Short mmCIF file of N, CA, C and O in Angstrom, two decimals:
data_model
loop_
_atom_site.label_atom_id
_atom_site.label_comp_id
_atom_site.label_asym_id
_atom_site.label_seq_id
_atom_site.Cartn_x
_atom_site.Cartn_y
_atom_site.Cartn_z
N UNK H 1 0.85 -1.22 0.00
CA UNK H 1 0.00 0.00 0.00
C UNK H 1 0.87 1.24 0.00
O UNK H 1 1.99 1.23 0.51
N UNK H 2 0.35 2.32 -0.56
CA UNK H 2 0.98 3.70 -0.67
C UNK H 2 0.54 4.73 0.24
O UNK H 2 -0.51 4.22 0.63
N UNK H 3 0.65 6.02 0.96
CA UNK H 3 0.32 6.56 1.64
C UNK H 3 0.73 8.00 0.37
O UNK H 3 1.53 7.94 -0.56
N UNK H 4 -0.01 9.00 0.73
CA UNK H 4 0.40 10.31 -0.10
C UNK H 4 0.09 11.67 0.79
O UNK H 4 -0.97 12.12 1.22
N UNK H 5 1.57 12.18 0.89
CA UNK H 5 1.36 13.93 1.69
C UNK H 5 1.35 14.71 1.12
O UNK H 5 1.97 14.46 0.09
N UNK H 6 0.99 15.68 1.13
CA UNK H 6 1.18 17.27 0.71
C UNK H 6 1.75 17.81 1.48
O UNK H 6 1.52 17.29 2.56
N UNK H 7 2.52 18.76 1.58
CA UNK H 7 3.22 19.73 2.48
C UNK H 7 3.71 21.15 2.06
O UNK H 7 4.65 21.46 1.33
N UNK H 8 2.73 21.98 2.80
CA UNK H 8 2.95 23.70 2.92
C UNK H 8 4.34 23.75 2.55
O UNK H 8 5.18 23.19 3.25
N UNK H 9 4.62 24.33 1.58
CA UNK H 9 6.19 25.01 1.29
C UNK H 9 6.70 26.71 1.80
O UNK H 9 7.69 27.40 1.59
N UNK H 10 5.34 26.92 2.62
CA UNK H 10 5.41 27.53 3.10
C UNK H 10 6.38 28.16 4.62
O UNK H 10 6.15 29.28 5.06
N UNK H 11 6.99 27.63 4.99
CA UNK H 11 8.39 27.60 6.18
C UNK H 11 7.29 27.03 7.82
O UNK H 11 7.69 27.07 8.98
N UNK H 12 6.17 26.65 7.43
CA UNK H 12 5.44 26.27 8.30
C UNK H 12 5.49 24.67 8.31
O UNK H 12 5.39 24.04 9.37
N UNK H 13 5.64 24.09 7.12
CA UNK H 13 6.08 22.95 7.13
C UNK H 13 4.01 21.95 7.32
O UNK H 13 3.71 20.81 7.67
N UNK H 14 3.52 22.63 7.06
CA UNK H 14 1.90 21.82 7.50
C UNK H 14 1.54 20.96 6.61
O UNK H 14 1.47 21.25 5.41
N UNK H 15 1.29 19.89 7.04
CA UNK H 15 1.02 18.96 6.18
C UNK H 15 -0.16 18.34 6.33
O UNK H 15 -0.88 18.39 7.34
N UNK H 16 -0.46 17.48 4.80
CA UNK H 16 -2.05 16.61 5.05
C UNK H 16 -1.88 15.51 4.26
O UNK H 16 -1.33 15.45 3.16
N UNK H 17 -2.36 14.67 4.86
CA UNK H 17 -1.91 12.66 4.81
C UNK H 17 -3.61 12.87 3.74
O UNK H 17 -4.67 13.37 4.10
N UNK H 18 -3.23 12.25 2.40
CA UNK H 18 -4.76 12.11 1.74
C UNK H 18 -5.50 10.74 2.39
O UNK H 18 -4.84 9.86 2.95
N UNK H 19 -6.98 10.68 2.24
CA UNK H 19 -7.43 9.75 2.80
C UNK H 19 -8.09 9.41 1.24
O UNK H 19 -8.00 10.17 0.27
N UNK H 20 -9.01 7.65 1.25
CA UNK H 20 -9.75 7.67 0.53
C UNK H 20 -10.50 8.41 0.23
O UNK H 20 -11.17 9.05 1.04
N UNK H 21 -10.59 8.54 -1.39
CA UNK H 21 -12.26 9.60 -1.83
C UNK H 21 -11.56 10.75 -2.07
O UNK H 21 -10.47 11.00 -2.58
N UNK H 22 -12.67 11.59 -1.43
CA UNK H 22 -12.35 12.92 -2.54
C UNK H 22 -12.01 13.72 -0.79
O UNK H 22 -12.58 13.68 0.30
N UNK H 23 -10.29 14.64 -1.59
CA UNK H 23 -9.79 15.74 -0.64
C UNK H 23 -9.82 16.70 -1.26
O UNK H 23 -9.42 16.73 -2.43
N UNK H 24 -10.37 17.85 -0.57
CA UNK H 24 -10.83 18.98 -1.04
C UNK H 24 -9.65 19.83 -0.38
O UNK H 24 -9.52 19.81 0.85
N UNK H 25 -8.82 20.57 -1.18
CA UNK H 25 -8.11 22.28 -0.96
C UNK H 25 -8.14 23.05 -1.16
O UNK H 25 -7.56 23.33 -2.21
N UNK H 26 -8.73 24.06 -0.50
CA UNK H 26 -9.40 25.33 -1.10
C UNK H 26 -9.14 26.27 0.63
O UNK H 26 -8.57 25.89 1.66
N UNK H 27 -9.79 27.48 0.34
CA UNK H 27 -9.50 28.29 1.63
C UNK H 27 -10.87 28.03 2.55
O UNK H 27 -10.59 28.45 3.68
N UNK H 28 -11.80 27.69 2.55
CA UNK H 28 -12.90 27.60 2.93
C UNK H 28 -13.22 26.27 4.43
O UNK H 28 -12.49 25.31 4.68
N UNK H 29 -14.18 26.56 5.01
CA UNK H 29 -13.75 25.61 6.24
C UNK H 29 -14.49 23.83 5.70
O UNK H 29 -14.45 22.74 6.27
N UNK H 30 -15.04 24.21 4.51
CA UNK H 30 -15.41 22.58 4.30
C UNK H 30 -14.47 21.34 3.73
O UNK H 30 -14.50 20.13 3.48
N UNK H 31 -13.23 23.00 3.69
CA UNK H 31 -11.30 21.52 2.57
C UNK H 31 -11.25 20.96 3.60
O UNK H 31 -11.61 21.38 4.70
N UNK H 32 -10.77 19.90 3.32
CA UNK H 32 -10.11 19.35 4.39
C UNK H 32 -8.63 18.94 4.22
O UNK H 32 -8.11 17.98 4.79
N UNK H 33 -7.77 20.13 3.01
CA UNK H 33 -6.84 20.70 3.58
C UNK H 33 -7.09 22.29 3.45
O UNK H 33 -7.16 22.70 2.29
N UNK H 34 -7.23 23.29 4.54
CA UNK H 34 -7.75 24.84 4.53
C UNK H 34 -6.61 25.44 4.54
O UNK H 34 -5.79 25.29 5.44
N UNK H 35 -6.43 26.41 3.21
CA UNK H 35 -5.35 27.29 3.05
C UNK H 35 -5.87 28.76 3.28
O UNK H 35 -6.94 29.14 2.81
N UNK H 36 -4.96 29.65 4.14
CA UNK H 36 -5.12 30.74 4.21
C UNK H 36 -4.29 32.07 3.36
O UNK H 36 -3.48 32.91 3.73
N UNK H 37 -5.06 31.72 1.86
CA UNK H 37 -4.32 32.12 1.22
C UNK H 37 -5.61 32.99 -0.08
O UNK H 37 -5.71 32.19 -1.01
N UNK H 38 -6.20 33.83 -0.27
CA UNK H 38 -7.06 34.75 -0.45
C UNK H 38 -6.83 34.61 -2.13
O UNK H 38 -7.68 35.22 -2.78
N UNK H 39 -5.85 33.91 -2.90
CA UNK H 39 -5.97 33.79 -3.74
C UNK H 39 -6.47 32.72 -4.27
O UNK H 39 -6.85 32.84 -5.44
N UNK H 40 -6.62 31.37 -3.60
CA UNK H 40 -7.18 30.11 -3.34
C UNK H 40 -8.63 30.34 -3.14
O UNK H 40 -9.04 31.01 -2.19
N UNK H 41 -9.47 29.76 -4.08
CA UNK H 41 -10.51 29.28 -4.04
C UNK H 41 -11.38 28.77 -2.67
O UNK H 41 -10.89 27.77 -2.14
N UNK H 42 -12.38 29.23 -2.14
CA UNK H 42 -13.75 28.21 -1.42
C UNK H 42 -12.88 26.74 -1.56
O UNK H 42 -12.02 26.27 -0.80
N UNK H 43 -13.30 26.34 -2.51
CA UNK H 43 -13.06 24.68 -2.81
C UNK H 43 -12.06 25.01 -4.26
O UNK H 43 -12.59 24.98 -5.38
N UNK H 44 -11.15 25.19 -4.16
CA UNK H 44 -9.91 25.40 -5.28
C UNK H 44 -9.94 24.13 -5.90
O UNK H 44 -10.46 24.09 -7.02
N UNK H 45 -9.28 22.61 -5.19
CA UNK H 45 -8.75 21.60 -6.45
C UNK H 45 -9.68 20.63 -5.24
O UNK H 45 -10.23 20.85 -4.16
N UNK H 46 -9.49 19.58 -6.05
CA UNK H 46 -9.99 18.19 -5.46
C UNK H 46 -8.54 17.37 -5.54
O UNK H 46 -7.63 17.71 -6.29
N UNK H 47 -8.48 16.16 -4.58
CA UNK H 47 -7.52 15.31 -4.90
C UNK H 47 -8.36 13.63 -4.31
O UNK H 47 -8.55 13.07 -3.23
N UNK H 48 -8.62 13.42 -5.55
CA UNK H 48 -9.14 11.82 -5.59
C UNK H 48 -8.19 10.72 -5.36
O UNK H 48 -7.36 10.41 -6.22
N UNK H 49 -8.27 10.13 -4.23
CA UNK H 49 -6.96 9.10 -4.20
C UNK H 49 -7.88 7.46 -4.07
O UNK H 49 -9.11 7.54 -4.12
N UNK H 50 -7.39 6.39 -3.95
CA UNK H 50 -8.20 5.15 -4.33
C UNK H 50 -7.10 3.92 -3.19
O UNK H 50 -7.31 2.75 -2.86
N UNK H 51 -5.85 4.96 -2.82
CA UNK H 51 -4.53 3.49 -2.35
C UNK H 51 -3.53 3.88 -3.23
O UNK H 51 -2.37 3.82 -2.82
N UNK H 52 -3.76 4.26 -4.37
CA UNK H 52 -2.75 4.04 -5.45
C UNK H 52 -2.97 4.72 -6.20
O UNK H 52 -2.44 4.21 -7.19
N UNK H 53 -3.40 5.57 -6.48
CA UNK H 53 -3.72 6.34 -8.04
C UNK H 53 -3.86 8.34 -7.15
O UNK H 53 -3.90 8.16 -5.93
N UNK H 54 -3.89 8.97 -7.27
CA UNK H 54 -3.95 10.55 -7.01
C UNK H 54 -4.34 10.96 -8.24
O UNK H 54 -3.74 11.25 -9.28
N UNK H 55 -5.66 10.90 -7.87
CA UNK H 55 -5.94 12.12 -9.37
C UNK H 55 -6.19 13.59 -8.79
O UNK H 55 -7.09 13.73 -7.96
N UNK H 56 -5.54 14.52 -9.13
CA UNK H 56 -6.06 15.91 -9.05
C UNK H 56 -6.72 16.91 -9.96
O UNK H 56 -6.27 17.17 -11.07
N UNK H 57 -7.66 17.40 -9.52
CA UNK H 57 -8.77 18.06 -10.75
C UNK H 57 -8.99 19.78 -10.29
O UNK H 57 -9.67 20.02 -9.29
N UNK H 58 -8.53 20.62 -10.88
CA UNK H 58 -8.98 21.90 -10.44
C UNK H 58 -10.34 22.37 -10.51
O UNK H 58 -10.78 22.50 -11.65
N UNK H 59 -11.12 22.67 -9.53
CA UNK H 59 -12.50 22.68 -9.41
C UNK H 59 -13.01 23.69 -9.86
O UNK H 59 -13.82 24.25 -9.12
N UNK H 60 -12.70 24.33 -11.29
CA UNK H 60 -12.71 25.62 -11.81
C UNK H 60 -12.71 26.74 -11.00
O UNK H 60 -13.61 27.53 -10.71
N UNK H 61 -11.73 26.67 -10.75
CA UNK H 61 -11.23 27.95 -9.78
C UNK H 61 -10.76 29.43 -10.05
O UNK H 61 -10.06 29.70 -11.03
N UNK H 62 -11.12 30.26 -9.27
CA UNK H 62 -10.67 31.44 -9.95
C UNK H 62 -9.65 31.74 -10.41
O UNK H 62 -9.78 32.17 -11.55
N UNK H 63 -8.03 31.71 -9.82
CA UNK H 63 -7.13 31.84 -10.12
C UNK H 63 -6.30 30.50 -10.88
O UNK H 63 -5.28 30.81 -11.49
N UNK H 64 -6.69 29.09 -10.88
CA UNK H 64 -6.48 28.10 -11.26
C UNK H 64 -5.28 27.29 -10.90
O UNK H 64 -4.62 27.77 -9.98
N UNK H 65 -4.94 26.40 -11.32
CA UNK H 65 -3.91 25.51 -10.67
C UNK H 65 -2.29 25.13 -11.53
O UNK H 65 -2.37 24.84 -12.73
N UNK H 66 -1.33 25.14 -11.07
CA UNK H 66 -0.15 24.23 -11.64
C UNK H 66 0.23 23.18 -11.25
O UNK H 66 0.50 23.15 -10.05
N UNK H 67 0.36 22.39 -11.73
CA UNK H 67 1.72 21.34 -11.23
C UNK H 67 2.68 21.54 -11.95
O UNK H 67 2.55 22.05 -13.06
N UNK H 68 3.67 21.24 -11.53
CA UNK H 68 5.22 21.72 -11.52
C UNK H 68 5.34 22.83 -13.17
O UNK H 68 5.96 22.51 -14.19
N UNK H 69 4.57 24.04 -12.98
CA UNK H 69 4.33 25.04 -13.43
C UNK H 69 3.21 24.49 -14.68
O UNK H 69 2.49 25.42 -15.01
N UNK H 70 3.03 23.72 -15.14
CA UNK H 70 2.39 23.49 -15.92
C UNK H 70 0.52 23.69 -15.51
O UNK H 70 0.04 23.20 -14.49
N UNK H 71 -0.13 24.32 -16.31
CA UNK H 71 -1.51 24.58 -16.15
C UNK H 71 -2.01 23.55 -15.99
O UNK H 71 -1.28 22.85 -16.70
N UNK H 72 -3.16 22.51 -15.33
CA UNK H 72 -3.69 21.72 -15.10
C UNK H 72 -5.46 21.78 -14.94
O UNK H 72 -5.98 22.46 -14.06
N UNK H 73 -6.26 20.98 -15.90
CA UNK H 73 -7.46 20.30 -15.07
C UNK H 73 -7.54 19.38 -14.52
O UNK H 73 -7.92 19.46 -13.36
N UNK H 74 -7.24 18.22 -15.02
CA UNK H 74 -6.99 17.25 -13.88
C UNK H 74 -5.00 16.67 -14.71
O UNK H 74 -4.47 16.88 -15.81
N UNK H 75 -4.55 15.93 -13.46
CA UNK H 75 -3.53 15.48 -13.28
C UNK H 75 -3.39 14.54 -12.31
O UNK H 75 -3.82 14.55 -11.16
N UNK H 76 -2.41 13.27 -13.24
CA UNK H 76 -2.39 12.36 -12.44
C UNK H 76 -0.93 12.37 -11.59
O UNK H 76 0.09 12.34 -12.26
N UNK H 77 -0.80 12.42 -9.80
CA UNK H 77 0.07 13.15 -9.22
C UNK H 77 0.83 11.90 -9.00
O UNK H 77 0.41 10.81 -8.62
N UNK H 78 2.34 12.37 -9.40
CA UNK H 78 3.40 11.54 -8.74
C UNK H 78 4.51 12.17 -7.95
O UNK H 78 4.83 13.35 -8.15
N UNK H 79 5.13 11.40 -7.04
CA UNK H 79 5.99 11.81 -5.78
C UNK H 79 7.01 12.82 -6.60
O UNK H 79 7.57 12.71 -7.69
N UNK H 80 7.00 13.67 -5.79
CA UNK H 80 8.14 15.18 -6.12
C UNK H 80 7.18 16.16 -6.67
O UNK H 80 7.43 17.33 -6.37
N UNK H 81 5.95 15.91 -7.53
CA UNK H 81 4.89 17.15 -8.02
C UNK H 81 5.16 18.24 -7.12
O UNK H 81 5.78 18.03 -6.08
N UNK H 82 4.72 19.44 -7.45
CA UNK H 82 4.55 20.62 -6.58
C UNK H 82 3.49 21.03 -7.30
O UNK H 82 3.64 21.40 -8.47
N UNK H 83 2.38 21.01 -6.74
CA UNK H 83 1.42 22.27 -7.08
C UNK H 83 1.17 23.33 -6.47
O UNK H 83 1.22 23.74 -5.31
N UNK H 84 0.82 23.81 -7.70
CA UNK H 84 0.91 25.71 -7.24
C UNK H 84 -0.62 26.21 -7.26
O UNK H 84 -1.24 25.84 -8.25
N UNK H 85 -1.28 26.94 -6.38
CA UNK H 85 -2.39 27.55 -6.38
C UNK H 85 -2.34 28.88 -5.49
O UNK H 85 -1.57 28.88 -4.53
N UNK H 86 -3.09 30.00 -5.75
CA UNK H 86 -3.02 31.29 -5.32
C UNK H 86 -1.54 31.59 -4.67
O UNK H 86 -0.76 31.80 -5.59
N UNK H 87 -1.10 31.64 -3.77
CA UNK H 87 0.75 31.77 -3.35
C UNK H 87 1.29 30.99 -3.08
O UNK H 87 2.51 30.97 -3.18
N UNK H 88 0.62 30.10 -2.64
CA UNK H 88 0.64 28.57 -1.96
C UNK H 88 1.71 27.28 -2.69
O UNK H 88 1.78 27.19 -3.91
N UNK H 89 2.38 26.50 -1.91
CA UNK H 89 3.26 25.65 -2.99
C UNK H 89 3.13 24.75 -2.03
O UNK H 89 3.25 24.83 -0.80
N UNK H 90 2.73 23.48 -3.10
CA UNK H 90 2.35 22.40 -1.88
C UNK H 90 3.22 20.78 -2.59
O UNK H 90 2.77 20.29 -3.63
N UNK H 91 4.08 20.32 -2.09
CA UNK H 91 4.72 19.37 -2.63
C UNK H 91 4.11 18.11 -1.97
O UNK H 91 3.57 18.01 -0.87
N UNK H 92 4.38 17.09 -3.03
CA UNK H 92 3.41 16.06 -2.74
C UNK H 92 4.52 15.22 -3.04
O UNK H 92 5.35 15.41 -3.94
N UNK H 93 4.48 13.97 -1.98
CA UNK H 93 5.16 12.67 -2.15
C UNK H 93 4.60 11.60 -1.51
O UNK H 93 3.96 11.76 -0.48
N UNK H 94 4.82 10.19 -2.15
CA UNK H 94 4.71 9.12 -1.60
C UNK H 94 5.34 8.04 -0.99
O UNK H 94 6.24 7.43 -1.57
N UNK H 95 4.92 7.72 0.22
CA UNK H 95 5.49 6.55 1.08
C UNK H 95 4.88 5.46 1.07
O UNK H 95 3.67 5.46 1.28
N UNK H 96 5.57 4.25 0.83
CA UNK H 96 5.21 3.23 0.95
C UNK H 96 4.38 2.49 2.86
O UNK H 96 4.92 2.88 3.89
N UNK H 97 3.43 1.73 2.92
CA UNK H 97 2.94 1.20 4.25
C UNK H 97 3.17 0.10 4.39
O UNK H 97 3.27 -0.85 3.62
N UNK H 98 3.31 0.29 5.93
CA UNK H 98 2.99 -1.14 6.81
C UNK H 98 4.46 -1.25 7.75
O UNK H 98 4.62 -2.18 8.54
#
């Protein structure tokens, strides 16, 4: 099994472990990862994970999304990605479980 983080590149270091289903990042209190970042969307991106697969989909957002600068609607995420949304830089990697 795989496990997948995101982590604030922000010097805060905050991070969020994805769970099954759908993870929502956006600035709003229903993400369940909440960025305080005014250029970030209510509900900015989704990140669909299954165990093994990370799909990320930008939830047509105002300012919109990158991974590793590249414009994105959806993207399928692998370890080292960085996505970029409103100031925010959030690097994503995977660890193996158990």
């Amino acid at each position: 099994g795989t496990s997948v983080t995101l982590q604030l590149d922000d010097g805060s270091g905050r991070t969020y472990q994805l769970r099954e289903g759908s993870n929502i990042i956006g600035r709003g209190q229903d993400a369940q990862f909440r960025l305080p970042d005014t250029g970030v969307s209510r509900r900015h991106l989704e990140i669909r994970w299954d165990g093994q697969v990370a799909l990320l989909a930008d939830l047509n957002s105002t300012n919109g999304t990158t991974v590793n600068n590249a414009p994105v609607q959806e993207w399928q995420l692998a370890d080292g990605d960085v996505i970029r949304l409103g100031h925010s830089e959030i690097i994503v990697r995977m660890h193996p479980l158990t």
